[PDB]
Paper text:
In order to shed light on this fundamental mechanism, we studied S. aureus FapR (SaFapR) a transcription factor that senses the levels of malonyl-CoA, a key intermediate in fatty acid biosynthesis, and modulates the expression of genes involved in fatty acid and phospholipid biosynthesis. Like most transcriptional regulators in bacteria, FapR is a homodimeric repressor. Each protomer consists of a N-terminal DNA-binding domain (DBD) harboring a classical helix-turn-helix motif connected through a linker α-helix (αL) to a C-terminal effector-binding domain (EBD).
The crystal structure of full-length SaFapR in complex with malonyl-CoA, determined at 1.9 Å resolution, revealed a different, more compact conformation of the repressor. The phosphopantetheine and malonyl groups of malonyl-CoA are well defined in the electron density map. The phosphopantetheine group binds within a tunnel at the interface between the two protomers in the SaFapR homodimer, and adopts the same conformation as observed in many acyl-CoA-binding proteins displaying the hot-dog fold. This binding mode results in the complete occlusion of the ligand malonate from the bulk solvent. The charged carboxylate group of malonate is neutralized through a salt bridge with the guanidinium side-chain of Arg110, and makes additional hydrogen bonding interactions with the main-chain nitrogen from Gly111 and the side-chain of Asn119′ from the second protomer. The engagement of Arg110 in malonyl-CoA-binding triggers a local reorganization of hydrogen-bonding interactions and surface reshaping that further stabilize the loop connecting αL to the first β-strand of the hot-dog fold in the non-productive conformation, thus preventing DNA binding. On the other hand, the adenosine 3′-phosphate moiety of malonyl-CoA is largely exposed to the solvent (it is partially disordered in one of the two protomers) and makes no specific contacts with the protein.
Numbering used by the authors:
A (entry chain A): 7 to 189
B (entry chain B): 52 to 189
Write the structure that this text describes.
């Protein structure tokens, strides 16, 4: 009971620091079964990872004004408008070359491009220019986490840098010059 | 000669027979010209699936997908992967537009083809991109 409570405190802290941590990762860290971790989360009222993602994205779509959920590519997991945003995208068979399992370049671009749009709190946002690098192959069943950050803003454009990752590996980089209008 | 739409699909069909880097099901648009390692063209009908529904403006990843597939199809190598690309959205493409993309090889190294893409709606230049395409024979 006493070991459990200390572990449960430690799990609350893990989730606070890293909201999108998996049960497997938690199982490793605390040397208990995935079953124990689920039960721990249940006592703590912390939903399973996919539910946490759905819940937070729902809240995020409420904060943006430049693009609608139905047209957004991936799940918007973090947004600080005009500053920083992140999305995740699961790569399914619909997103790859079937023979190699390699993700299509337009898929990674769509995720990054959509994220730069959602990040900017303006009614009109249009991509003007983009420079991108496909650093490592993204594969079937990978989850891509894209991070976008505003690096400059003028009267007519936001300049945004995007870096996208599979686990800890940088797989894609893009610089986006985004046109906006307050009308 | 069959109907206009049929003919285009047949020219596309016969064009996918001279390429080896990508297949019909994975190619965005219709491949209307291919001169391997030199030049290719494709056309793409912009339907409601490809636009922002509120404004009718084509999604940038759609125009990019056309241009990107076209560059792949152009290069007559077993392995072809986009390494880098730099693109410009010059004019809004709209619902019901047909975009004609033209890809031209401008340079070639041991490891990459450098390809320039220009996309048009009728006579208007709407999109431009430079694509650095990795290739391998093996
Ligand atoms: C371009 C790169 C291969 C360059 O990496 P390196 O410098 O290590 O490459 P290299 O010259 O040593 O060549 C090794 C690569 O050749 C290819 N290769 C080698 N032998 C092969 C074989 N028997 N069968 C198939 N492919 C083979 C593999 O990709 C291999 O990568 P390895 O050694 O790693 O196995 C890589 O940086 C990369 O994959 N970047 C990501 C590219 C990408 O995913 N582009 C977007 C999707 S394609 C796209 O955008 C087009 C579209 O969607 O239409
Ligand atoms: C960025 C531009 C508006 C800049 O044009 P100008 O330099 O002529 O613009 P300007 O400063 O005179 O301002 C005119 C514009 O103000 C506002 C209206 O959009 C109006 O467009 P008007 O000139 O019509 O009156 C234009 O080049 C353009 O529309 N480019 C196409 C952008 C685009 O379609 N991006 C891809 C889709 S969006 C995208 O990629 C995001 C996504 O899909 O998620």
């Amino acid at each position: 009971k006493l070991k459990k409570d200390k572990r449960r405190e430690a799990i609350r802290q893990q989730i606070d620091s890293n909201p999108f941590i998996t049960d497997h990762e938690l199982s490793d860290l605390f040397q208990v079964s995935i079953q124990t971790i689920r039960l721990d989360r249940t006592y703590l009222n912390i939903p399973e990872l996919r539910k946490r993602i759905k819940l937070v994205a729902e809240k995020n779509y409420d904060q943006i004004s430049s693009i609608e959920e139905q047209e957004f590519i991936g799940d918007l997991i973090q947004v600080n408008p005009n500053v920083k945003a992140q999305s995740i995208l699961d790569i399914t068979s619909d997103s790859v070359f079937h023979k190699t399992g390699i993700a299509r370049g337009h898929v990674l671009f769509a995720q990054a491009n959509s994220l730069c749009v959602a990040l900017i709190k303006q009614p009109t946002v249009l991509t003007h220019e983009s420079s991108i690098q496909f650093i490592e192959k993204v594969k079937l069943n990978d989850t891509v986490r894209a991070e976008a950050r505003v690096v400059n803003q003028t009267a007519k454009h936001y300049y945004v840098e995007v870096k996208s990752y599979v686990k800890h590996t940088l797989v894609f980089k893009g610089n986006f010059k985004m046109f906006y209008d307050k009308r």
